[PDB]
Amino acid sequence: STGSATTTPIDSLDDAYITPVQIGTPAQTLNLDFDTGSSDLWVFSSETTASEVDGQTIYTPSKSTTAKLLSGATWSISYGDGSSSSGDVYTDTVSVGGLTVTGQAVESAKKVSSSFTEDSTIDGLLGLAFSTLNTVSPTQQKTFFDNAKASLDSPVFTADLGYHAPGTYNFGFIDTTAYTGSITYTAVSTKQGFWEWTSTGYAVGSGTFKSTSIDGIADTGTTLLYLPATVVSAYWAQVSGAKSSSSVGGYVFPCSATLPSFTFGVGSARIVIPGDYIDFGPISTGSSSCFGGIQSSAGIGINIFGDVALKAAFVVFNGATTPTLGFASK
Ligand SMILES: N=C(N)N/N=C1\N=C(N)c2ccccc21
Ligand SMILES: N=C(N)N/N=C1\N=C(N)c2ccccc21
């Protein structure tokens, strides 16, 4: 089997992407944030505290003839950004882009934190990291990909995120028309449960490439590119007036600037992030200071190749016996 679904930015800045997912019988379609940095499929639901729902579409398990309570199971997750959610668990039929998994754990939120409530466009998350990070207790549950894997034509999924435009998540096949050149594959460590890999270095704009190992994770659920402070300083030093602002919480730059590109290494290959991809717009409406798309990972404890980086590439999440990541230009 295979599946193919379009993913759409939630706003004009690509702050996140939503992908429609069919849950239950008859289908209830919710728009979920596909997150290769976490491993829970959770949804706003008929059980979510009413004051914490503001425009989201909810899953109602009582209206699904295939829903079954996973008796005794609960979940609770805290994300690196400080947001959180928790609740109980059903199993149900879940389809993405024509690919169907029966018996998928669907984690129904009883509580969500304020940032989830405030995002009326995101009805929940679909985790695509390794199932060892799944939070369901006392019986940990498998991700949608983990459950689908054996049925797929090939044990892979791909992320092809757009810049200020829709893109595609495919399951079970590589669309060789969606990229240029060849795919460079690189080793993955699953020891922390992430798609963790080592970039071979970077360049700023037209500058020379610096060969240096940068361990980090491929995370579709993180908006920005978080890298070591040395790398980030070298980038922003090429932008007149750019500075790290403690009040804003990161690097900002004049909205009048044209940003340089940023290149990262994948083995001997190179992925070029155009400068415009690094512009996240005014820090507050109408401000002449703009928010940078490359930020320091200092304090987070891991480097994160989030959407800013991934959207510059066609990215293969290879879930074969030995998992690997692939990157191609596009
Ligand atoms: N990851 C999410 N589930 N939602 N992320 C966001 N939601 C926003 N409104 C926003 C603005 C700037 C950066 C990220 C986000
Ligand atoms: N803290 C602030 N006053 N503004 N923070 C932002 N402003 C943006 N444009 C943006 C995009 C992505 C992530 C954060 C921000």
* Cβ-based neighbour number of residue 52 at 10 Å: 18
User: Is residue 254 domain-shared with residue 158, that is, in the same domain?
Assistant: no
Helix, strand, or coil (residue 71): strand
Residues 315 and 196 in one domain: yes
Q: Are the beta carbons of 10 and 103 closer than 8 angstroms?
A: no
Examine the domain organization and report whether 199 and 128 are in the same domain: no
User: 180 and 131 share a domain?
Assistant: no
**23 and 112 housed in the same domain:** yes
- Cα separation of 43 and 195, whole Å? 23
**Cβ(149)–Cβ(99) below 8 Å:** no
Does one domain contain both 73 and 100? yes
* Domain of residue 53, residue span: 5-174
Measured between alpha carbons, how far is 177 from 225 in angstroms, rounded to an integer? 26
Q: Are residues 145 and 186 in the same domain?
A: no
Q: Which structure tokens are listed for 66?
A: 């295939």
Which residues, including other chains, have CB under 8 Å from residue 286's CB and lie 6 or more apart? none
Question: 15 CB less than 6 Å from ligand 1?
Answer: yes
| 134 within ligand 1 shell (Cβ under 6 A) | no
Based on the fold, state whether residues 82 and 124 are members of the same structural domain. Answer: yes
Please check whether residue 187 is in contact with residue 324, taking contact to mean a CB–CB distance below 8 angstroms. Answer: yes
- 68 with 119, same domain: the answer is yes
Of 147, 174, 201, which one is at a domain's C-terminal end? 174
**DSSP label at residue 236:** H
Q: Which atom of ligand 2 is nearest to the CA of 283?
A: 7
Cβ contact 36:309 at 8 Å = no
Say if residues 125 and 42 touch (Cβ distance below 8 Å): yes
Q: Obtained via which technique? A: X-ray
Give the separation between CA 276 and CA 123, rounded to whole angstroms. Answer: 29
Q: For 207-221, b where at least 16 C-beta lie within 10 A, e where not — what string? A: eeebeeebebbbbbb
- Within this chain, do residues 152 and 190 fall inside the same structural domain, yes or no? no
Number of domains in the chain: 2
* 47 in Cβ contact with 57 (< 8 Å): no
- 152, 174, 196: which is the final residue of a domain? 174
* Shared-domain flag, residues 310 and 207: yes
> Could you give the 3-state DSSP secondary structure of residue 131?
helix
170 and 185 belong to one structural domain:
no
| Domain-terminating residue out of 174, 200, 222 | 174
* C-beta of residue 99 within 8 angstroms of C-beta of residue 3: yes
Cβ of 32 below 6 Å from ligand 1? no
Name the nearest CA neighbour of 33 among 148, 121, 141: 121
Tokens of 55: 């425009």
